[PDB]
Amino acid sequence: GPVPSRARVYTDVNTHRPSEYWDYESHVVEWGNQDDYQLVRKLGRGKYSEVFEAINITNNEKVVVKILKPVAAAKIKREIKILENLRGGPNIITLADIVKDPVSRTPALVFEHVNNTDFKQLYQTLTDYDIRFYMYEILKALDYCHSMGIMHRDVKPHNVMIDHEHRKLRLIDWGLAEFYHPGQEYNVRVASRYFKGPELLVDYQMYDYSLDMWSLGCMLASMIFRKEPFFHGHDNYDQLVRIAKVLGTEDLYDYIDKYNIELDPRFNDILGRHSRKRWERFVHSENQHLVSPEALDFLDKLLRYDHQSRLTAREAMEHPYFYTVVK
Ligand SMILES: Nc1ncnc2c1ncn2[C@@H]1O[C@H](COP(=O)(O)OP(=O)(O)OP(=O)(O)O)[C@@H](O)[C@H]1O
Ligand SMILES: N#CCc1c[nH]c2ccc(Cl)cc12
């Protein structure tokens, strides 16, 4: 069968911590008072929750309430444990409280409010300097959660909130996050289609923190090249073909050979034979202002089929792409 794999960093974090840290099933939730919060307006409804802007009437402060849809108690206690473990970490959304919603009879997570800049506005107006600045801020959040034995598994633009006026960034929506345990087989039905790592697309379950780095690479590529999304697959199979049209098929076959993976036979008549493309092929007069040799080198080191070969968040912070960023 497949060859096992482990992260090259933060491998032993969860074994050295007390079991209470990662055993989220055993965690006893400390319930707050639901009357402290007055719902103001529905912000959205996702697959697993309804999000509302609300006011904390005990301090007059704006909050965001996420009322979970009844799904599975295991998924709920896991998100709570991760948010509590990560609380106070750099650029990590702060969980302010946990209440029982009187209508849904389900938990409602209360978060600090971010006066966030519109997502299209961000996509359309962030400068070269702003992309480097904010990528550096995401890297602080990712290295923190990875050093804490947690993988996000849903890195994408909508999950990265920016209040551009205050140059404030927050990594949100920890509902797909999981504790990393070496040798554990994880569910590959994670991350949004355009941000899914090749490991997910080839059904390799023994993945790790490096999945977040691929997703970050997809975000970066879309920003610097002005192509939204960068890898535009019609479904999970065509998503891998879209990647192969850029990275090529030879390195893909080397990847599956290394891990003794068998590609789903549906790929035999759709994958084709593609050479790896040079990143300069995606440069044009409308994105030249966001591209540099340092940006292309950085991207190249994130977007690699072999998960073990990608830059870690801490190595990524050392990259020349960030030398211009004020620290
Ligand atoms: N802490 C927060 N502060 C301010 N707004 C938030 C906060 N958390 C979530 N939101 C906002 O809540 C609204 C609804 O979010 P939801 O979870 O439904 O994600 P989405 O943008 O709707 O979709 P997806 O994640 O699937 O792309 C979004 O506009 C999101 O920006
Ligand atoms: N794509 C896109 C837009 C965007 C949303 N959140 C972001 C965080 C960082 C950067 Cl560079 C860009 C974004």
Curated annotation (Swiss-Prot):
This enzyme's EC code(s): 2.7.11.1
Keyword Disulfide bond: no
Gene Ontology molecular-function annotations: ATP binding; Hsp90 protein binding; identical protein binding; kinase activity; protein serine kinase activity; protein serine/threonine kinase activity
Keyword Phosphoprotein: yes
CC per GO annotation: cytosol; nucleoplasm; nucleus; plasma membrane; PML body; protein kinase CK2 complex; Sin3-type complex
Catalytic residues (positions): 154 (proton acceptor)
Intracellular or extracellular location(s): Nucleus
Protein residues bound to ATP: 43-51, 66
Region annotation Interaction with beta subunit: where it falls in the sequence: 34-39
Keywords: Apoptosis, ATP-binding, Biological rhythms, Cell cycle, Disease variant, Intellectual disability, Kinase, Nucleotide-binding, Nucleus, Phosphoprotein, Serine/threonine-protein kinase, Transcription, Transcription regulation, Transferase, Wnt signaling pathway
Origin: domain of life: Eukaryota
Catalyses which reaction(s): L-seryl-[protein] + ATP = O-phospho-L-seryl-[protein] + ADP + H(+); L-threonyl-[protein] + ATP = O-phospho-L-threonyl-[protein] + ADP + H(+)
Regulation of this protein's activity per its record: Constitutively active protein kinase whose activity is not directly affected by phosphorylation. Seems to be regulated by level of expression and localization.
GO BP: apoptotic process; chaperone-mediated protein folding; DNA damage response; double-strand break repair; negative regulation of apoptotic signaling pathway; negative regulation of double-strand break repair via homologous recombination; negative regulation of proteasomal ubiquitin-dependent protein catabolic process; negative regulation of signal transduction by p53 class mediator
Top-tier EC class: transferase
Start and end residues of each Protein kinase domain: 37-322
Tissue: Expressed in gastric carcinoma tissue and the expression gradually increases with the progression of the carcinoma (at protein level).
Post-translational modification: Phosphorylation does not directly affect casein kinase 2 activity, but may contribute to its regulation by forming binding sites for interacting proteins and/or targeting it to different compartments.
Described purpose of this protein according to its UniProt entry: Catalytic subunit of a constitutively active serine/threonine-protein kinase complex that phosphorylates a large number of substrates containing acidic residues C-terminal to the phosphorylated serine or threonine. Regulates numerous cellular processes, such as cell cycle progression, apoptosis and transcription, as well as viral infection. May act as a regulatory node which integrates and coordinates numerous signals leading to an appropriate cellular response.
Disorder cited: Okur-Chung neurodevelopmental syndrome: An autosomal dominant neurodevelopmental disorder characterized by developmental delay, intellectual disability, behavioral problems, hypotonia, speech problems, microcephaly, pachygyria and variable dysmorphic features.
Self-association state and partner proteins as the record states: Heterotetramer composed of two catalytic subunits (alpha chain and/or alpha' chain) and two regulatory subunits (beta chains). The tetramer can exist as a combination of 2 alpha/2 beta, 2 alpha'/2 beta or 1 alpha/1 alpha'/2 beta subunits. Also part of a CK2-SPT16-SSRP1 complex composed of SSRP1, SUPT16H, CSNK2A1, CSNK2A2 and CSNK2B, which forms following UV irradiation. Interacts with RNPS1. Interacts with SNAI1. Interacts with PML (isoform PML-12). Interacts with CCAR2. Interacts with HIRIP3.
Additional remarks: Can use both ATP and GTP as phosphoryl donors. Phosphorylation by casein kinase 2 has been estimated to represent up to one quarter of the eukaryotic phosphoproteome. Casein kinase 2 has been found to be increased at protein level and up-regulated at the level of enzyme activity in the majority of cancers. However, elevated levels of casein kinase 2 are present in certain normal organs such as brain and testes.
Similarity comment: Belongs to the protein kinase superfamily. Ser/Thr protein kinase family. CK2 subfamily.
Protein name: Casein kinase II subunit alpha
Organism: Homo sapiens
